[PDB]
Amino acid sequence: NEVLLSPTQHHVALVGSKGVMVLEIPKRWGKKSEFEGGEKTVNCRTIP
Amino acid sequence: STSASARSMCRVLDDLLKKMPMLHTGGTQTLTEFELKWQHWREECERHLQNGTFSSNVHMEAVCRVLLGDEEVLLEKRDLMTTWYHFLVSRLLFKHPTVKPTELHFYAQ
Amino acid sequence: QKEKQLEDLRYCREERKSLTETAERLAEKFEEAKEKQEDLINRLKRIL
Amino acid sequence: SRACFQVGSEEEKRQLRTESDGLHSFFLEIKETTESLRGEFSAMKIKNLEGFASIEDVQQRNKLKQDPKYLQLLYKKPLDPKSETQMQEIRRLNQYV
Amino acid sequence: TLHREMEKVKLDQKRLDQELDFILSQQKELEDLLTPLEESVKEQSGTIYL
């Protein structure tokens, strides 16, 4: 249904008429606006 | 304590041993309840073996496979399994919660 | 996810040998610094 | 029939778990080695500063030995760091023995 | 977790390498400054006052 962002800027929550799916997205700073200055091996899995 | 990644496996084994019923479940209580508890423990062991956590450690995997009912390790290491008397009593302890005389003789032969 | 984990493990295996190389480099540099300090301490003892 | 029963085999998962455990152990031992190394580097820097202070004091006393006022300075001074630390080490060794 | 740990380890190892290079430079400077002083103390030790 909708999406929400954590106030600490670290979690993205997909909310729908059945539950939420939380995903951990690190901060974007340095290099080409990548995670922690160039990182693509972070945890990118949804949790119910 | 000797290893570095077997504490969870040891805790799972201890939980399974605790779930395994003893004498306070049958004999002087209810044979049907004892058989139900034995079947529950057996199916819990099969579920824990088929979940996939027993993929590593060939020792504990073989132990869990023997605890189910498969005697492939016993047939392979029959030189250490003493004799067929102990083989039969092990089969009885494994897959025989209730023994029948005719069935006992059949399994013996 | 399996392909990503395999690529991450290959990158980690390469970084393992990279860190081992830099570790033996740091070890030889530390041995050089230790022998230099030992020579300096021996000279100071002979002076005093 | 299109839906597979499982993705991959247990051998791949076992290999991944063993590699992860080995990497964890290697990183832990490397962190411990680097901590010991940074402690040794701090000790070596402390020893280097001690040697610098020692050679500075040596140069100072060598320059002061060639002065006539050093005699009166030593006669008026009621203490001295060299004799102080010497008697300190002597008393420590004596009490230990 | 392994990636974060190895990144922190690499950063700490680079910092330690820089610190050890600075320490080795300081030790070389100390040795070069102490080399001419090893002969001055040997000559002053022979001066025995009566």
From Swiss-Prot, chain B:
It comes from the Eukaryota. It is found in: Nucleus, Nuclear pore complex; Nucleus membrane. Belongs to the nucleoporin Nup85 family. Component of the nuclear pore complex (NPC). Component of the nuclear pore complex (NPC) that seems to be required for NPC assembly and maintenance. Involved in nephrogenesis. This is Nuclear pore complex protein Nup85.
